[PDB]
Amino acid sequence: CHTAMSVLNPGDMRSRLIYNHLRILAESVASGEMTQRTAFRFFESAVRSPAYREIAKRQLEG
Amino acid sequence: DASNNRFFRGYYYGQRELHQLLGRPHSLEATNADGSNDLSTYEANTSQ
Amino acid sequence: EKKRIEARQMMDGRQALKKKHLDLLREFHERQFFFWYERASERLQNMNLINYVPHAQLREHIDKELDKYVAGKNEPYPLNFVGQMPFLEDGDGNIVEV
Amino acid sequence: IFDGPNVGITPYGGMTRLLARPETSLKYPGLAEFVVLTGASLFAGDALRLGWTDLFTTIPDMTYHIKEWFDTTEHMHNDAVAWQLGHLLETCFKMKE
Amino acid sequence: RRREENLYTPIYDFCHRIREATEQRKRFVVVPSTIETRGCARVMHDHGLVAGFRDFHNDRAFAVELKYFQGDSTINVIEPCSYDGRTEFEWSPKMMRRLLNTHGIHNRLVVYICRTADNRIIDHIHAVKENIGGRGLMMVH
Amino acid sequence: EERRHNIHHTHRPTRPLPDFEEVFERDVEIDGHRFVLRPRWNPRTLQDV
Amino acid sequence: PVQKKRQEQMLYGVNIPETRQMKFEEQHPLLAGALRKLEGQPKGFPFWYRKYPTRRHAYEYRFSIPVEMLDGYNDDVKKALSKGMMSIQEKQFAQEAMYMERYAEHDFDTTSPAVLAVKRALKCRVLRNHLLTNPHNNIIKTVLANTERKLNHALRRLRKVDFKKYWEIIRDHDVQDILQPPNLVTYRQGSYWKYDWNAGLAISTNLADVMDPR
Amino acid sequence: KDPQGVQRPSPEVYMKLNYKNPATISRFLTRTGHMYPADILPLNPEAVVKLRV
Amino acid sequence: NPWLRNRQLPHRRQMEGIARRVCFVLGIPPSEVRIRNLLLPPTYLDKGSIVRLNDIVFRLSNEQSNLLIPWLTNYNKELDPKDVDYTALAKTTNEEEWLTL
Amino acid sequence: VFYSFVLVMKPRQRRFTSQALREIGVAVYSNGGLIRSITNEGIMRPYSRFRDADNTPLTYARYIILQLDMGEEEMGKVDKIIREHQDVLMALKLNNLERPVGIRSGNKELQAAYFPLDTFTRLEEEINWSPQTSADIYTQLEMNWKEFSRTRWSSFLRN
Amino acid sequence: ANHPNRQSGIQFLTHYNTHQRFRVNKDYIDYMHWGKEQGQARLPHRHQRVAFDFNDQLHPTRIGYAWFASQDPTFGHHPDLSSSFDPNYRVFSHPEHWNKMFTKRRPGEGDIDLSVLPSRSLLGPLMAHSDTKGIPYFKVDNRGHSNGRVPGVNAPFFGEFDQKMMQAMSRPLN
Amino acid sequence: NAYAAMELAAEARREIHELWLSAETALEREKRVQQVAALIEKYKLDPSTPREADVSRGLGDAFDRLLLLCLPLGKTDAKGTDNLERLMHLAGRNGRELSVRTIQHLFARTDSFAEALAVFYTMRRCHVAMNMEAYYSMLYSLQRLEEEGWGQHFRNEYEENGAPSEQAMDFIVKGISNALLPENKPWLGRVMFQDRNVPDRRYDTRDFDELDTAWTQRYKSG
Amino acid sequence: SEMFRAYVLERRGATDVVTHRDAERAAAWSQQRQREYDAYCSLKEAPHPRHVYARLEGCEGKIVSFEFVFEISCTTTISRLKSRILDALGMPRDRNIDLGWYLPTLDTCPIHSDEELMQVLHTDPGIEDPKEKLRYPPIYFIVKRCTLYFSEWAYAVKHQLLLQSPFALRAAFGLLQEVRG
Amino acid sequence: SIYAHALSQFAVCRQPWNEYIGLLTKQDSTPYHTEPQEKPAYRGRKQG
């Protein structure tokens, strides 16, 4: 829920890249390998695309 | 003297007094290995 | 020796520059003086319009003033500094009209 | 600006090749002589259409972003490198949307 | 402000500025501009302890740009050699040579920075190279 | 300016200084085109070359 | 008696020395020629500006109003900007500017030892008489003592810059009391003379004019 | 926007904040004549000086 | 001083000034006046400077010069590499005046 | 102004009021000072009863505004003269009139840094507004500005 | 440090003459009304800061658009050019400026200096108004921008904007 | 209606240019002043004239070269200063601001000192807001007046001698002793970082003409 | 200060009222100033008979001159001026043409509207050489062509080919055809 | 420049990217814009 609703602009979530980030972290929240906090802070700090904010100014206002 | 002997180029007691006497500008961390930033006026206007 | 001739070249340069700075500062001061005169002249022109009570005109003025509210006139009366209509006294300052 | 018959000399800098590629004769017949004879400027659009270069960007201070993107990047194996560079190119310099 | 207090050097304070701006994870620091200070800056930028630096020929200051890696700083610790200006520490070539040696293995990790009789600001490794002794400034790794 | 006021920049100088009047020819007429200012090339015209 | 005389001579008023009118005439003879034509007639162009290079230079009338700017106005105005109408603070600033002008080496000079010494001498006198009247404000006891210390510095720098101005400052304002070495102990160690070593003028003398070096 | 009003009063009011404007004094006091505690009716420090004076 | 040269040769304002002042005093017609600068090396004097001193300032045809000054033929002295640029001067903008001389 | 006064006075028979104001005026002229305006107002009803020399409380009193130019030294003399006169109930003194509260705070004055001559030239009335002032003077003011600014030089450069 | 009046801590990254913020006799801070936008009340105000964050903007260059003519015709006001920006700006602090200590702290009491906040009174613009136009018309002043000719401010600006400082600190390779 | 006013203003400017292109010794000080006054009183250039049917609107740029045609004031009366302030007053009404070039040549026109003061005072009466341009042009004009006085003195003394003194020489070199806005320090006379010295010397008519003609050729070509 | 002492007390109807004794006088004054403003503005619109110079922007030098009366009360006048300019230039009247003001400061402005144009007439007195005798004050316009024709284009390109060293023109053509092969 | 003049007619202005990217159709757009409320800051070690 938090990854869907708690994050403004988590890139395009359809692209295989960010998708694989999400997949892996989920499988690591299940099976207790990571804490939810750590997995969430991972998810938002995961690598997306160079000059990310400045590309975000080309789509989103706020 | 201050070129070949490290004990001379110690600043805050020997070199400081000297520079104040001779009227050079000086400071803690300076350009010359000395307290001295620059020559005094006598040294700039006179060939020794 | 070489170090000293260029060190003094630098020094004399710098002293020359602070002379030049000196002229520039004088000149700036003159400038803002002319402007000062612009404003100050202008204010004093207005102060020349003030009617000062001289010693010769004193009691004439005092009495022109004590008669400001004399308890009858044909014209509208001036207010106070506190913005009131005060009591209209006749000659000699008796309280006639409230 | 490939010019210099205007300063009384022949153009230098190799761009002559680009101008004489059979490709340019195809797309813009006559352009080669236009630019070589008349000193006249070419710009992003025309460099793109002649296919002189593939890459274009409107982003402020691209240089910083390139720097700090390659700082977050990790290994030196040429797969990693291929992808990192390629992803950078695709996201900014190749024109979509 | 008073007697017993240390007498500060624009080295002491240079170091503590960098330290503190590394702790608050800032990208730029404004720093005092004297000779051995920007000397130290160049040395640190050589060893890659600092992202970059510039002097603008501003008189008071110049500015350093800090580097971070894996979430924390590139600088573990940075300490001045002397608390006062009234104390001046001299480094023999042999001492500076000792620093380099960790029980028989040659270790360049930590960097120590010197004035020379010649007014150059050097690391201890070049110093040892030519066997000159120099005055201590700081140590950073 | 230098050309007018400085002898050491004109007469037998160290390094040469360009002259405007020499570089440019004023008011040229070539076959329907009026040039305010056109430079001086020794083969003046395209036909001449 | 001397200081007292200085305060009485500040209180009732001050004056610009015609020293300045003189040098104004010999330096810029054209301008003084113009003003010389225009006496008594109201001026719209301030020819007199060279005479007053600084805001502070005009003390004869309040708010830095040069005398000849008052030509075409009312005489009530003339009495309104006169000395008699100054506040006390203004009058101090008057004494200060006139003296600062006497000892200045150029017009915009403040920092120089002579100027400093005089201004501090005056300020010190003012605070002194102030304390004479209203006994306990220790804020100003302290400000007086600090001013005095800074005066001591200025003077001991003066006598190594040039000593005759030093002399006649001491003779004008009667401060010899703050040049007296404080106590025998520190004097005996040569730390009274040690001062001008620190100030850096210790070698400044340039013998050859006095005291043949041979 | 103003935690402690520098906006209150608006400019012209200042003119009348002297001793001879009983009305304009009164619009800044209580019904008893006391001033309002700072965090009740916040005023630009100018206005407080001029007012108590 | 390479610092103090930049000022040394007169401003155009001063050349205009001197010109019309000569016009006042000498009676020379302002129509034809040609006022020029010749600026010589600081510590010594090369061939070039003497040639352009002989040739231009005083008008001397080469024969009356070789007559009057025989040794010019053997005089080879020329500018040293260090001294080459004394002629070339720094150009300062007018909003820059407070910084550099 | 340089100085101002408000003089709350016992409402006597006019010859006495004229005498008293002549006493005060002569007390100002003696001490080498000027009077910008001596303004008369009526007999008002204050918020506080005042007692005069007889300790007889007073419901009514005449108000009189003074505007002076002195030195500050002998205004001490003028002041202890005024307050000691039997027919002056109260006197309030305004010394702030050259530098009033509204100026010289954090570059509030445009085109200058504290030009003192503004509020000196002025009379008290326009520094401290009286209650009756409304938006109307905003018109009057400028008809008196523009007008003034037209004729000043012409009138000054006459003589 | 638990001592009161020592709470402002040790900051080196200030511009003051001591690294111990609590001995600094210049600017006394205000814990109750301060720190809306700077976080803690101890820390330096936005305009006075001598150390800068990665993703935060740094100080605006002051002016005191004509010079962008060579740029994109659309380009608006460059975010770092400010009309009014002062590094020396006194922020109102009650314990300094309104000091209630010698009083009982009742409503009107406390001593105030008004030289801090710019005057909102009408008295200023009324008193000073004049037929002579202002300082800028009169071109009273010498100098100009203190750095002489400046591409953003005085003269025209060509080429590129660098908003990150990337070129502005680089190392000469030559 | 006012179209007629403009037409008659075209006749006006036609004869203004007629008299300005004279610029001769046939045009003496007396002659020029009375010819100018004649033009004014022919075309009703007083401030009394109504707003419409005011002849000076449609004199463009003929206005200021009519204006500085007033300037050297003949020796009869103090009447002269009025012709000038008629013209100027009209400007103040009509809305045309006075260009700095115009008033720089206007002071450059001045023969004596009291005349320069006369002009400054005149535009004081005319509600001209003084600038640094006004002030510096004035000072420059004073300076060239004295440089002219001394130039005259030394040529005079050179004539009765036949070879110049050294005072003549160093006067020629460093100019006026202790001048205001001097040449040796050029950075002083400046205003907008542009240098202000027009007024330092006299100008003929063809000089003025040269400047604007140059401007016009510049348009017609570049 | 004598404005502020001028209020007064009068009774209107049944009620007491404070008024400025001079209020209506100031009103008459402000009214007069308003009517003057009006006269002035209206007169700025009044017919302005000025000489017109217009320079066509381009490598082909041409400058059209004619006398023109500007009537600025009742857009259409700008387009009358444009139509005329085109008539003299030898072009159809439908050319999209940008007028622009050539300033005496050597700057340039666009003029999009009449209310502006009136002010360009008013503000610039004209700058003219008097030896040359014009009956009216000139103005100086620049004319930008929003549409190049082919004829135009070729003109420009010929103007440049004629403007560079022939030997190098011919040379460089040789060089291109030699690289090209 | 004395003559670039021939070049200047077929010369090309530089395109308006700032407002073009401003006016691109965006997926955060709102009929009426609202400014975000103020975010939580760090008030120091005791406050969090």
How would you list the strands of the sheet with J34-44, edge to edge?
Answer: J34-44, J61-69, J3-9, J88-94
Q: For residue J1, with 0-12 CB atoms within 10 Å meaning exposed, 13-18 middle and 19 or more buried, which class applies?
A: buried
Does residue J58 contact residue J52 with C-beta atoms inside 8 Å?
yes
Cβ within 8 Å, pair J18-C79: no
Residue at token pair 């805050």: B12
Q: Tell me the pairing of strands E61-65 and E28-32.
A: antiparallel
The per-residue DSSP string of A29-44 comes to: HGGGSS-HHHHHHHHH
| Angstrom distances, CA of residue N27 to CA of A5, A15, A59, N16 | 16, 18, 6, 22
Q: Pick from A58, A61, A62: which is nearest to N21 by CB?
A: A58
| Three-class SS state of J98 | coil
Looking at the complex, does the CB of residue D72 fall below 8 Å from at least one CB of chain N? no
Q: How many CA atoms lie within 13 A of K108 on its CB side?
A: 13
Whether M18 and C50 lie within 8 Å, measured CB to CB: no
| Cα distance between residue M150 and residue M133, in whole Å | 39
State how far the Cα of F37 lies from the Cα of F25, in Å rounded to an integer.
Answer: 6
Element (H, E) at M50: strand M48-56
Question: With an 8 Å Cβ cutoff, are H46 and K97 in contact?
Answer: no
Q: Do G30 and L121 touch (CB under 8 A)?
A: no
DSSP I57: I
Beta bridge partners of M63: M55
CA of K79 vs chain N CAs: smallest distance (Å): 13
Total number of residues shown for chain L = 222
Contact C41, J157 (CB under 8 A): no
CA distance L99 to L86: 17
Residues 136-155 of J with CB under 8 A from M: 136-137, 139-141, 143-144
Location of structure tokens 């180029």:
B9
DSSP M60-72: S--EEEEEEEE--
Whether I25 sits inside 8 A of L197 (CB atoms) is no
Q: Which chain L residues are Cβ-neighbours of M103 within 8 angstroms? A: none
Taking CB atoms and an 8 Å limit, are F8 and I52 in contact across chains? yes
β-pairing, M7-12 vs E90-91, is: unpaired
CA distance C3 to chain J (A): 47
Q: Does residue M180 belong to the interface with chain D, where contact is any CB pair within 8 Å? A: yes
Q: Please, is I37 exposed, middle or buried when counting C-beta atoms within 10 Å of its C-beta (0-12, 13-18, 19+)?
A: middle
Residue burial C4-20, b: 16+ Cβ < 10 Å; e: rest:
eeeebeebebeeeeeeb
Q: Is-contact G51 G20, C-beta < 8 A?
A: yes
Interface check C65 vs B, CB under 8 A: no
Here the tokens at position J45 are 């009803």
Q: Which residues of I touch C9 (CB under 8 A)?
A: 1-4
The Cα angle at residue G74 between residues G70 and G76, in degrees rounded to 5: 105
DSSP string, J27-74: HHHHTT-EEEEEEEEEEE--SS-EE-TT--EES-EEEEEEEEE--SST
**Preferred mutation among G30, G47, G49, G50 to probe L, highest tally of L CBs within 10 A:** G30
Residue G30: CB atoms within 10 Å:
19
| K92, HSE (Cβ side, Cα atoms, 13 Å) | 21
Residues 6+ positions from G122 with CB-CB distance below 8 Å = G6, G92, G95, G96, G99, G173
Determine the distance in angstroms separating the CA of J49 from the nearest CA of chain C, rounded to an integer.
16
Closest CB from M53, M130, M133 relative to L209: M130
Write down how long chain M is: 181
Contact C48 G108 (CB under 8 A): no
Amino acid identity of C55? H
Q: Shortest CB distance from M129 goes to which of L3, L52, L213?
A: L213
Q: How many CA atoms lie within 13 A of G66 on its CB side?
A: 23
Q: CA-CA distance, L35 to F25, in Å (whole number)?
A: 46
Tell me G189's DSSP state: T
Buried b / exposed e along M54-78 (16+ C-beta atoms within 10 A): bbbebbbbebbeeebebebeeeebb
Taking CA–CA distances from D37, the nearest residue in chain M reads: M169
Measuring CA to CA, which residue among M35, M34, M39, M48 is closest to residue M118? M48
Write the residues followed by a gap in chain M (C–N more than 2.5 A): 74
Q: Do C13 and I4 touch (CB under 8 A)?
A: yes
Alpha-carbon distance D10 to M171, whole Å? 7
CB C91 within 8 A of CB J13: no
- Breaks following residues of chain B (C-to-N distance > 2.5 Å): none
CA L197 to chain centroid, in Å, comes to 14
K154: closest chain I residue by CA:
I95
Question: In chain E, count of helices (H) and strands (E)?
Answer: 4, 12
What's the sign of the alpha-carbon dihedral L55, L61, L62, L64?
positive
Determine, for residues M61 and F36 on separate chains, whether the beta-carbon distance falls below 8 Å: yes
Cα separation, E109 vs J137, whole angstroms: 81
If you count residue pairs, one on J and one on K, with CB atoms under 8 Å apart, how many are there? 58
**K3: helix, strand or coil:** coil
- The rounded Cα J103 to chain-centroid distance in angstroms is 20
Tell me whether I53 touches chain L (CB under 8 Å): no
Under DSSP, is residue C59 helix (H, G, I), strand (E, B) or coil? helix
d(CA J41, CA J64): 6
Please report all neighbours of C, defined by 3+ CB atom pairs within 8 A.
Answer: B, G, H, I, J, K, L, M
Q: Is the alpha carbon torsion for M118, M124, M127, M130 positive or negative?
A: positive
CB–CB of E17 and K169 under 8 A? no
Neighbours of chain B (3+ CB pairs under 8 A): C, E, G
Nearest to I25 among L155, L194, L201 (CB): L155
Q: How far is K92 from chain C (nearest CA, A)?
A: 31
Alpha-carbon gap, residue D24 to J118, rounded angstroms: 77
Q: How far is CA J37 from the centre of its chain?
A: 7
Q: What are phi and psi of C70, to 5 degrees?
A: -105, 5
Three-state SS for M98? strand
- Residue K158 in tokens: 């060509």
Contact H24 J130 (CB under 8 A): no
Contacts of G16 (CB under 8 A, 6+ apart): G59, G60, G98
- Which residue of H15, H36, H48 is in closest CB contact with K122? H15
What is the Cα–Cα distance from J146 to J150, expressed in whole angstroms?
A: 6
Please name the residues in contact with J139: beta carbons below 8 A apart, sequence gap of 6 or more.
Answer: M23, M26, M27, M30
The alpha carbon of residue K129 is apart from the nearest alpha carbon of chain C, in Å, by 9
| In contact, J124 and M4? CB cutoff 8 Å | no
Contact E54, E16 (CB under 8 A): no
By C-alpha distance, the chain J residue nearest G76 is: J34
Q: Give the three-class secondary structure for K27.
A: coil
Residues of K in contact with E13 (CB under 8 A): 12, 19
Q: Which of G92, G89, G48 lies closest to G67, judged by CA?
A: G48
Q: What amino acid is encoded at J102 in this protein?
A: G
Pairing of strands E52-54, E61-65: antiparallel
Compute, in degrees rounded to 10, the torsion defined by CA atoms E81, E87, E93, E94: -80
Chains D+K touching (3+ CB pairs under 8 Å): yes
Question: What residues of chain G lie within 8 A of the CB of C54, using their CB?
Answer: 76
Closest CA to M130 of C46, N37, L205, J92: L205
Do M166 and F44 make contact, defined as CB atoms within 8 angstroms?
yes
Report J:138-157 residues touching K (Cβ under 8 A): 145, 149
L158 interface with J at CB cutoff 8 Å = no
Within 10 angstroms of residue I99's Cβ, the number of other Cβ atoms is 14
Residue for token pair 């004076």: H53
H46 burial type by CB count under 10 A (0-12 exposed, 13-18 middle, 19+ buried):
buried
Residue K53 sits at the chain E interface (C-beta within 8 Å): yes
Joined together, the tokens standing for residue G57 give 């230079």
Quick one: M9 exposed, middle or buried, by C-beta within 10 A (0-12, 13-18, 19+)? middle
Task: Compute the 3-state secondary structure of chain I and give helix, strand, coil in percent, each to the nearest 5.
Answer: 50, 0, 50
| Measured CA distances, A21 to A6, A37, A54, G91 (Å) | 16, 15, 22, 81
Distance between CA atoms of E113 and E44, rounded to whole angstroms? 9
**Within a 10 A sphere around the Cβ of C87, how many other Cβ atoms?**
20
| CB distance L47 to L93 below 8 Å | yes
Cα L145 from Cα L199, distance rounded (Å): 10
Beta-carbon contacts of H22 under 8 Å, excluding residues fewer than 6 positions away, are: C82, J131
In the numeric block, the tokens 């935060």 are attached to K56
Cβ separation E118–B33 shorter than 8 A: yes
Q: How far from G35 is each of C45, G141, J107, CA to CA, in Å?
A: 21, 48, 36
Q: Is the Cβ of A47 closer than 8 Å to some Cβ of chain D? A: yes
Is the backbone peptide bond immediately before H9 cis, with ω within 30 degrees of 0?
yes
What Å distances lie between residue J67 and C36, G81, G145, I24, J123, CA to CA? 27, 16, 40, 62, 8
Is residue J141 within 8 Å of C68, Cβ to Cβ?
no
Q: Is E50 helix (H, G, I), strand (E, B) or coil?
A: coil
| Neighbouring residues of G165: CB distance < 8 A, sequence distance ≥ 6 | G103, G114, G158
Q: How many CB atoms lie within 10 A of CB G119?
A: 20
Q: How many CB pairs under 8 A join A and D?
A: 24
Tokens encoding D80: 């990693």
DSSP structure string for D26-92: HHSTTHHHHHHHS-----HHHHHHTTS-------TTHHHHHHHHHHH----SHHHHHHHHHHHIIII
